[PDB]
Subunit: 340 residues, 3 copies
């Protein structure tokens, strides 16, 4: 909601309280989503100031406050800043921003990140260019310097992030994406490669000194319809754990498919049908193994722009004999959302 707006600056303080619960049999250990209360809230801000007619400066911070922790020792578990960046946009020259933001490959994955509850599977955090990452300088151009309506690109420079953890770490890399959108249609291609840190390499699984990820996407967005599909691959980027050996590393290779079909009725009900499969190749020891494999059926009802509720159902296709220990059980998410 725009709480402020005077002297060319407008602030939008936003957020949401989400009452959420996951239903999966057992202790949700062998299920897709786990089981139980998963309530949380979000608070963030989106500022934007008009330095003059062509120039705009802006910033954005979004945080994630878990709502399923005690007020005890575990009170902080799960909390975190998701985004944090400032930037500038100049006339038709493009925009530039730096901070914790979305990797460029997500310019593609974003297409199928539309399930009611469950977040796009391959769009992981602090995992190179696919999801939110720290210290990324990102340039974006729209309409090819205003010469070509609908043609946009982006390039992105990722700073090395040497964390205490091989999974949350990354070396320096570059990434770019080109997309084109003409009347309800959209096509995209994204790609980025990056150095792997000593620790990432000291890991038992995955072998390389460079990590890559690219995805392409196609979408039809219009007439209350939303059909979207993505296909991409990766090398030594995808984080995987062998639950048996308690071994971890990155998938040498993966092939990721995502499809999403949705319809927005005029009365508020938005049904969703999706399919996601990601399979690792050449995992050291196991060979080929599926990481994510399921169908999804669900529906969201929008009371209005501030209230909605939804049920998301995961028909997990993974099988009980999955070598990595990847869970085979179903998960049903029911949630109620208020937001501003």
């Amino acid at each position: 909601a725009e709480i402020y707006n005077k002297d060319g600056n407008k602030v939008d303080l936003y957020g949401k309280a989400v009452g959420l619960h996951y239903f999966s049999k057992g202790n949700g250990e062998n299920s897709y989503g786990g089981n139980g209360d998963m309530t949380y809230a979000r608070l963030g801000f989106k500022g934007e100031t008009q330095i003059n007619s062509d120039l705009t400066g802006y910033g954005q911070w979004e945080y994630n406050f878990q709502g399923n922790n005690s007020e005890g020792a575990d009170a902080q578990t799960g909390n975190k800043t998701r985004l944090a960046f400032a930037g500038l946009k100049y006339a038709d020259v493009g925009s530039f921003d730096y901070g914790r933001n979305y990797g460029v490959v997500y310019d593609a994955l974003g297409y199928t990140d539309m399930l009611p509850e469950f977040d796009g599977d391959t769009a992981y955090s602090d995992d190179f260019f696919v999801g939110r990452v720290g210290g990324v300088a990102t340039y974006r151009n729209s309409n090819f310097f205003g010469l070509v309506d609908g043609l946009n690109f982006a390039v992105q420079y990722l700073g090395k992030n040497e964390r205490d953890t091989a999974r949350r770490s990354n070396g320096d890399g570059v990434g770019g994406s080109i997309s084109y959108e003409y009347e309800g249609f959209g096509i995209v291609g994204a790609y980025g490669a990056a150095d792997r840190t000593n620790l990432q390499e000291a890991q038992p699984l995955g072998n390389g000194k460079k990590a890559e990820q690219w995805a392409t996407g196609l979408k039809y967005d219009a007439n209350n319809i939303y059909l979207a599909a993505n296909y991409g691959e990766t090398r030594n980027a995808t984080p995987i754990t062998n639950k048996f050996t308690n071994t971890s590393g990155f998938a040498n290779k993966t092939q990721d498919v995502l499809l999403v079909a949705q319809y927005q009725f005029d009365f508020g009900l938005r049904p969703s049908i999706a399919y996601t499969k990601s399979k690792a190749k050449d995992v050291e020891g196991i060979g080929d193994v599926d990481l994510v494999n399921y169908f999804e059926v669900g529906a969201t009802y929008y009371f209005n722009k501030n209230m909605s509720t939804y049920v998301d159902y995961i028909i997990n296709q993974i099988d009980s004999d999955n070598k990595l220990g990847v869970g085979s059980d179903d998960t049903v998410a029911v949630g109620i959302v208020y937001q501003f």
Copy 2:
């Protein structure tokens, strides 16, 4: 404060900065409240959108930022989300919400949770239905479907919360409360029982596979006067620690009495006189032991709706020979509050 309100949605961003200090002799280890700086702040939001004439959706998140920590390693100590839930209210059919919210038994305890500084003693956090708990679905009806002015009830379904800690954990349970308020008067009865988790049972103190808590309350609220009283009991719900043995568990049984008498002068001064006693019964090893026993005298002055200050004094009746090690010293809280 209502920062937003357009298109049927209104947001109230609220909060307060509380400069607080506790005065107790010694290292506050043997005192009621402890000793020293206890400054903190709160930030939260309360949204509410009118989906149509009969339907209202809403949400609420409130956080607690401690203000007495260094900017060092201990910076986060004490911080936590207190509430987080979204919900809906339909005409005269009632309301329903889910998330981290107040247990139904607090519908009663709330009566005597009026001391200037010190929080109602028996109204503990992540302790079944008495205080704030995670994952509670709560239905509430007002005025008996609008047929009976002043008659309200609530039922509540608590989801199992298996935490790393026996004290912050809970099994599934149900709770309900009926209250009636006719012209300044209010009466209430609340009750709820819940399963105890393996860990809660693996504990040295307290013996059962089910935890219960009920309280009743009576209040006269009007003419600048506020007299309130509560009485309740509990089984294997009340958390207790034996400071000698460093033993912990839950009180097999307790009997809790709370009384509160206050007056709001027209110039701002609200004096408070209270009495609280809670005694455990059949504690494994000790027999009967008082957990909370003191008188309270204090006063709050309201400069206006945004500023106030208060002194709260605890005349601890607990004695030095209390078997559990429960402190016997007095505590004096002085605080200055700004709030919006």
Copy 3:
């Protein structure tokens, strides 16, 4: 930004998203500022209510959300509440506030805390009266009860803070400062002494049972010019670590010099030239050692009151043979800031 303002109360919700990066050779271990992404954001509130013509109540909370952490285990690293206090101001009698706030000696140091990125060096956190500290009651008078235009003073009572850490701890102490400002000029003197906790004394470095700190400052602030200079000393207050021995404690004595010269062009560019030197005396084992020694050159450009960017360059004068292990490398900070 003032989001609220009705019925004599006005709330200012403020904050900023700072995209920041530090460039230093090596692993920034031997540099002045370290190296890499250092993006972060801030959110705070400043309330103020007019209880009547002479009386004003107010409060303030400011938090620091790091933006360079993963969404993993390290998500919280670096976060903290910087300020948290409520208070009152009465006519010309002065003001009083309590909570986590700025030590009185900072009334002086504040003069040279003007570098684009790098925070005043000697103005440390949870270090007695120089920077932000917990539990400080602070009285401030302006214009000598309104009798003497430009004459202000402050006294401050610091509560003992026994933390788990000798560095973040402190005993009870008092501090005061007198400053005078006549037409663009300002002069100040500040001083405060405090008890040292058992733990602070159980430390290997620094010897005393009382810690002191005073600084004086002189400034010319006007005509787009800002020249400021500070000089102060300290006893057993300054925290120091010997990187070789992994020894820590406080400097027996220090002599701190800070100078700052800046100019604000009319088009937005504010260049900065500074000099800082702090040297420890009589360090147990080493003798005299410099702690901070460098020049600074940098410039900030203000697009407007909401957007700016800056480069700050540290020409570290410390030498590689510094006995404590204090880094000798340069650091270059580049940052983009959006703020409201």
